[PDB]
Amino acid sequence: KHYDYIAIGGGSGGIASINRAAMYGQKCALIEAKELGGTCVNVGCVPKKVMWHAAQIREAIHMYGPDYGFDTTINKFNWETLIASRTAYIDRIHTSYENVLGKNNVDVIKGFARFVDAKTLEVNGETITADHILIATGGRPSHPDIPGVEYGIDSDGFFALPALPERVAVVGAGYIAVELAGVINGLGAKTHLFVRKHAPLRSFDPMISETLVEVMNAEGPQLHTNAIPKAVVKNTDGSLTLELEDGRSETVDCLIWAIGREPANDNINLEAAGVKTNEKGYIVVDKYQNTNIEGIYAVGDNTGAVELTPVAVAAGRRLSERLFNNKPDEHLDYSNIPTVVFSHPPIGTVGLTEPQAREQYGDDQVKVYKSSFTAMYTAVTTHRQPCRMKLVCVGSEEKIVGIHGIGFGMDEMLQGFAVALKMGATKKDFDNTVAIHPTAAEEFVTMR
Amino acid sequence: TKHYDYIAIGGGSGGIASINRAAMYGQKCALIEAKELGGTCVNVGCVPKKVMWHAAQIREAIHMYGPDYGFDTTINKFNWETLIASRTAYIDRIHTSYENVLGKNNVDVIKGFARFVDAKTLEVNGETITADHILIATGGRPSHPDIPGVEYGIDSDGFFALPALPERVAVVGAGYIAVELAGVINGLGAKTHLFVRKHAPLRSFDPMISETLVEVMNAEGPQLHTNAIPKAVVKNTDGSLTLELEDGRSETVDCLIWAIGREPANDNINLEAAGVKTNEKGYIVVDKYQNTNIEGIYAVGDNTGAVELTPVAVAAGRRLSERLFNNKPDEHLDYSNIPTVVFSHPPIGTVGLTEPQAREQYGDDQVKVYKSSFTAMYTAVTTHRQPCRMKLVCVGSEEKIVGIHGIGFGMDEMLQGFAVALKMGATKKDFDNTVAIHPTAAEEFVTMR
Ligand SMILES: Cc1cc2nc3c(=O)[nH]c(=O)nc-3n(C[C@H](O)[C@H](O)[C@H](O)COP(=O)(O)OP(=O)(O)OC[C@H]3O[C@@H](n4cnc5c(N)ncnc54)[C@H](O)[C@@H]3O)c2cc1C
Ligand SMILES: Cc1cc2nc3c(=O)[nH]c(=O)nc-3n(C[C@H](O)[C@H](O)[C@H](O)COP(=O)(O)OP(=O)(O)OC[C@H]3O[C@@H](n4cnc5c(N)ncnc54)[C@H](O)[C@@H]3O)c2cc1C
């Protein structure tokens, strides 16, 4: 069959790009091998945040509730109820995506697509062709090459767990590892986080990784630094022992590898089409998401750009705007992208870390404002938690170039500040806005 | 007589903020406070109210949302004395923090009630003190209706003094304080009734907000009673109270809270002696710079009739001290586009014009509204789904944003940054060119179509 536009992959980039193209009168197909919504709906953003809210409830009950006067017994934590509630919600989201594609008159093809040539794809026996093809195949979890690697599960396997294990080891140091260790610790399992160097989230502003270690030392998970996995041994009683190169070992009931992800660009016969990948296997794209082959584009996690859904969505929509709505220079600016990590406590960051701003503008130019306070929710309890915020300003005008915070409230406060940063906010702009009291967010507009 | 450069009558939000900033530029200052430092906000307002909102959030997490997340829990005991002890200890720590700053600033704090002797002289505890600049920042107090049995009701000060949680509670009023208190008390488990005089609470807020709030109250409490005009309160034989309305409806509760309004506390300090003029409602009249009619006397905060919020008293007090003592002859607070959060169930955040106000001021042809409505993800997996509704109000070709309104989980922390953007003159394009953060409620404002 022939189409104007085909997107291979029904994840964040594929759905956003095909719906926007279909609005401009293009006849479109979307090929998806598994579930609509991709990694973020099914094994990513959405089920992760439900599990985070579940940890938050268990912490309100068990950790903070006693100092607020609530003596509570958790009679049972029914894991199947939570998974059944999470699954029904994701099923409702699937139905909504289908409804939107249908209204848009997009043909959804369920199957695994491979290139025959630059303009031709085979899917389920059938051959289809199009003048514009978007490869938005995402990625998948990496696994280390060590003895016993196969006794560990990865983030996909975490969402498929039948019960919460008693003792859990999470290996990795990026935001996924930190979020999963934070959620599993919050639900009551004995949780260990193993990072290779001295702290998780090493690329984040120092204030953020410092505070997170602080919190972890006070409330779990148990952090183990300088940990290089060497082997995993399955024990007679079925437990696992993770061996570190330095001789340390830990015996857990479940081990999750959360070391990194790799691109899923490999069994689709890119060779036929002549699309060039880079060393790491990412599809190489220019500013405009163009591959080396005229008429083939890539967006999302398979291009090696930052691995976030809003980025695959925004790049995918701007691409359909360029191709089909004659906006020849439309493209995503990949700077000043806001990130929230659903750690305990949450992290929000946009712009340059203080080290980056100093390297780029010089210490002479950089003024940093910082605030450290106890989160009001925790201030009346014996489990007080820090909240730390930093504004990084450059020049005499103190133009804001980085906003960073860790503490309750960071997840919802950051979006509006990211709009202000994108507009070119100076410290004066923030100070001239009246605070909202009592909130964590008013700290950014009353820094001195 | 002791003589000061600057004296503030009232140690609450505006008095403390103004005196500290004056003291920073070397002015010798006195602060007179008749009760506790921090004023209404610290002692019977912002701070204890938010601590009780958190306690209602924890009881809702245990009792309402937790079972659908798989937690089967028994609340063995809700110890109110423990909650009140934690709350009170926290406020005592804040009193100490204020004392520390004022002390480091060499401000003389006088505990007693001040009254004017003439335009430059105050008497406090039999002593006389004088100053070249006097700031009246006396705040306000709860109003009470003039009807039989009003004294069987308490007001919001009395709420923070409750010795226990009553089983049945009536809150009478329709503004943000009645709404917050009724949602907290309901969240804490009491049978709660909210009585409003017309069709909905928060009638001055954008219609989307009062509408959604009614929906939520009808689904999860408090019980809302509209067109309610209190006629009398009867104390019954058993101790309960029956509130009787003008149209003949009646309700028997164990506690009744008046949260109908607040009046200025400007009536017992002998303003006459100083020559200061107040308006019909008893507020002190000030200009753009917080000047009263008497040269050298100024007023800020709730006793001027401006918007009754702590950040506004603070910002106007600090800018007044900059204008007077740090050579900024034009410094003053812009009272437009002040953001507000209401800690209702769910919270509300608003800044700028409501859709009605924007249509009246700019005409229907100029106004473009964008709206979004969805289920809060926290509640979406439970049997107690709660709406989240958001609205951007835009004007002109450029779609300049003039109002941002929302009700739903997350509105309390997301609004500050969008208020900065609105203050910067943001258009809908500026929100649209910012990359979203997923999954949040706040990303809805940058992806509206
Ligand atoms: C545990 C976890 C948590 C995360 N949390 C967040 C978060 O909270 N916020 C956030 O912004 N980001 C989050 N992310 C990242 C986000 O999920 C990704 O960045 C986003 O999904 C990437 O979009 P995409 O379009 O590139 O690919 P994907 O969503 O991965 O989708 C690609 C689709 O291609 C399909 N497919 C692959 N090859 C073929 C083929 N040849 N034929 C047909 N179909 C094919 C796949 O089945 C898949 O559905 C998270 C990721 C993980 C793993
Ligand atoms: C229940 C409730 C909840 C609220 N919640 C919020 C909120 O969450 N956020 C928010 O921004 N605002 C909130 N407010 C509003 C806020 O509390 C007020 O706007 C703020 O306190 C006003 O500051 P002020 O300086 O004008 O007066 P106040 O804080 O009231 O202080 C005035 C002070 O003057 C003292 N005084 C009076 N007369 C004399 C005298 N002659 N001599 C000596 N001392 C005297 C009083 O004892 C008092 O301490 C709330 C108010 C209430 C009642």
CATH architecture, domain defined by B337-449? 2-Layer Sandwich (3.30)
B384 is catalytic: no
| CATH pick for A336-448 out of 3.30.565.10, 3.30.390.30, 2.60.40.10, 3.40.50.450 | 3.30.390.30
The set of long-range contacts for B222-225, using a CB threshold of 8 Å and a minimum separation of 24, is B222/B171, B222/B182, B222/B183, B222/B185, B222/B186, B222/B192, B222/B193, B222/B194, B223/B191, B223/B192, B223/B193, B223/B194, B224/B193, B224/B194, B224/B196, B225/B193, B225/B194, B225/B195, B225/B196, B225/B249, B225/B251
Listed residue (A48, A336, A339, A369) closest to A204, CA to CA: A339
The set of long-range contacts for A372-378, using a CB threshold of 8 Å and a minimum separation of 24, is A373/A443, A375/A345, A375/A407, A375/A408, A375/A409, A375/A440, A376/A438, A376/A440, A376/B50, A376/B51, A376/B54, A377/A64, A377/A408, A377/B54, A378/A64, A378/A408
Angstrom distance (rounded) from CA B346 to CA B378: 12
CATH 3.50.50.60 positions along chain A are: 1-141+260-335, 142-259
Q: Beta strands of B201-305 (E only): which ranges?
A: 223-225, 230-235, 241-245, 250-253, 255-258, 262-264, 297-299
Angstrom distance (rounded) from CA A402 to CA A357: 8
| Ligand 1 neighbour A307 (Cβ under 6 A) | yes
Q: What order of strands is seen across the sheet that includes strand B168-172?
A: B223-225, B191-195, B168-172, B255-258
In angstroms, what is the span from residue B140 Cα to ligand 2's centroid?
6
Listed residue (A262, A265, A260) closest to A276, CA to CA: A265
Listed residue (B21, B8, B226) closest to B105, CA to CA: B21
- What is the C-alpha R_g of chain B? 24
A140 backbone φψ class: left, alpha, beta (φ>0; ψ -120 to 50): beta
Angstrom distance (rounded) from CA B324 to CA B26: 12
Which residue type is seen at B172? V
Chain B positions in Cβ-Cβ contact with residue A337 (cut-off 8 Å): 435
Give the dihedral sign, CA B186/B181/B44/B173.
negative
Resolution of the coordinates, Å: 1.9
Q: Is residue B351 within 8 Å of B421, Cβ to Cβ?
A: no
- What is the C-alpha R_g of chain A? 24
Residue A41: strand, helix, or coil = helix
Q: Is residue B6 within 8 Å of B317, Cβ to Cβ?
A: no
Is B74 in Cβ contact with A57 (below 8 Å)?
no
Angstrom distance (rounded) from CA B435 to CA A418: 8
Angstrom distance (rounded) from CA B355 to CA A426: 30
CB < 8 Å from B in window 303-322 of A:
308-311, 313-314
Q: Is residue A223 within a helix (H) or strand (E), and if so which, with residue range?
A: strand A222-224
Listed residue (A50, A156, A94, A62) closest to B69, CA to CA: A50
Residue A104: strand, helix, or coil = coil
Angstrom distance (rounded) from CA A329 to CA A322: 7
The CA dihedral of A402, B443, A22, A139, to the nearest 10 degrees, is: 60
Residue B252: strand, helix, or coil = strand
| Ligand 2 neighbour B156 (Cβ under 6 A) | yes
Chain A closest-CA separation from residue B273 CA (Å): 35
CA A339 distance to own-chain centroid: 8
In angstroms, what is the span from residue A191 Cα to ligand 1's centroid?
26
Q: What would the two tokens of residue A110 be?
A: 């369920």
- Best residue among B310, B320, B411 to mutate for probing ligand 2's pocket (most ligand atoms within 8 Å of CB) is B310
Listed residue (A49, A64, A69, A59) closest to A374, CA to CA: A64
Q: Whose CA is nearest to atom 7 of ligand 2?
A: B46
Listed residue (B391, B399, B397) closest to B418, CA to CA: B391
Listed residue (A50, A279, A8) closest to A159, CA to CA: A50
Q: Is residue A442 within 8 Å of B309, Cβ to Cβ?
A: no
Q: What order of strands is seen across the sheet that includes strand A229-234?
A: A229-234, A240-244, A249-252
Which residue type is seen at A207? M
Angle (CA) B28-B32-B34 rounded to 5° is: 165
Angle (CA) B385-B188-B243 rounded to 5° is: 105
Please, how many CA atoms are within 13 Å of residue A275, restricted to the half-sphere of its CB?
Answer: 32
| Ligand 1 neighbour A15 (Cβ under 6 A) | no
Q: Which residues, other chains included, contact B364 with Cβ-Cβ below 8 Å and sequence gap of 6+?
A: none
Angle (CA) A157-A160-A164 rounded to 5° is: 95
Angle (CA) B117-B121-B122 rounded to 5° is: 70
Experimental method of this PDB entry:
X-ray
Angstrom distance (rounded) from CA B194 to CA B438: 36
Q: Is residue B321 within 8 Å of B18, Cβ to Cβ?
A: yes
Which residue type is seen at A355? P
Locate the chain B residue with the closest alpha carbon to A62.
B62
Alpha carbon separation from A196 to A149, A229, A230, A252 (Å, rounded): 17, 9, 12, 18
Angstrom distance (rounded) from CA B220 to CA B226: 17
Query: In sequence order, what are the beta bridge partners of B248?
Result: none
Angstrom distance (rounded) from CA B319 to CA B27: 15
Angle (CA) B388-A315-B418 rounded to 5° is: 40
Give the dihedral sign, CA B437/B438/B441/B444.
positive
Q: In ligand 1, which atom is closest to the CA atom of A111?
A: 43
Which residue type is seen at A322? R
CATH 3.30.390.30 positions along chain B are: 337-449
Angstrom distance (rounded) from CA A346 to CA A317: 29
Fold of the B1-142+261-336 domain: FAD/NAD(P)-binding domain (3.50.50)
Angstrom distance (rounded) from CA B298 to CA B135: 5
Phi, psi of B304 (to 5 degrees): -100, -10
Q: Does A382 touch chain B (CB under 8 A)?
A: no
Phi, psi of B425 (to 5 degrees): 85, 30
Q: What would the two tokens of residue B380 be?
A: 């979406």
Angstrom distance (rounded) from CA A326 to CA A324: 6
Q: What would the two tokens of residue A354 be?
A: 């203080």
Give the dihedral sign, CA B21/B22/B25/B27.
negative
Superfamily grouping for domain B143-260: FAD/NAD(P)-binding domain (3.50.50.60)
Other C-beta atoms within 10 Å of A162: how many? 8
Exposure of A336 by Cβ count < 10 A (0-12 exposed, 13-18 middle, 19+ buried)? middle
User: In B233-293, where does DSSP find H-type helix?
Assistant: 271-274
Residue B393: strand, helix, or coil = strand
Chain A closest-CA separation from residue B242 CA (Å): 30
Query: In sequence order, what are the beta bridge partners of A231?
Result: A243
Q: Does B372 touch chain A (CB under 8 A)?
A: no
In angstroms, what is the span from residue B289 Cα to ligand 1's centroid?
56
CB < 8 Å from B in window 73-132 of A:
73-82, 85-86, 88-89
Superfamily grouping for domain A1-141+260-335: FAD/NAD(P)-binding domain (3.50.50.60)
The CA dihedral of B416, B417, B419, B420, to the nearest 10 degrees, is: 120
Angstrom distance (rounded) from CA B314 to CA B297: 18
Alpha carbon separation from A103 to A108, A227, B136, B373 (Å, rounded): 12, 51, 64, 20
How close are the terminal C-alpha atoms of chain B, in Å?
67
Give the dihedral sign, CA B306/B310/B312/B318.
positive
Chains A and B form CB pairs within 8 A to the count of: 257
- With residues binned 3-state (H G I as helix, E B as strand, rest as coil), the percentages for chain A, rounded to 5, are 35, 25, 35
The DSSP output letter for A63 is I
The annotation status of B114 as a binding-site residue, yes or no, is yes
Angstrom distance (rounded) from CA A193 to CA A280: 26
| Ligand 2 neighbour B407 (Cβ under 6 A) | no
Angstrom distance (rounded) from CA A50 to CA A44: 10
CATH 3.50.50.60 positions along chain B are: 1-142+261-336, 143-260
Q: Annotated active-site positions of A, please?
A: 437
Please, how many CA atoms are within 13 Å of residue B265, restricted to the half-sphere of its CB?
Answer: 17
Residue B258: strand, helix, or coil = strand
What is the dotted CATH code of the domain comprising A142-259?
Answer: 3.50.50.60
Chain B closest-CA separation from residue A126 CA (Å): 36
Peptide bond into A438 cis (omega under 30): yes
B168-172 and B191-195: which strand pairing?
parallel
Q: In ligand 2, which atom is closest to the CA atom of B340?
A: 11
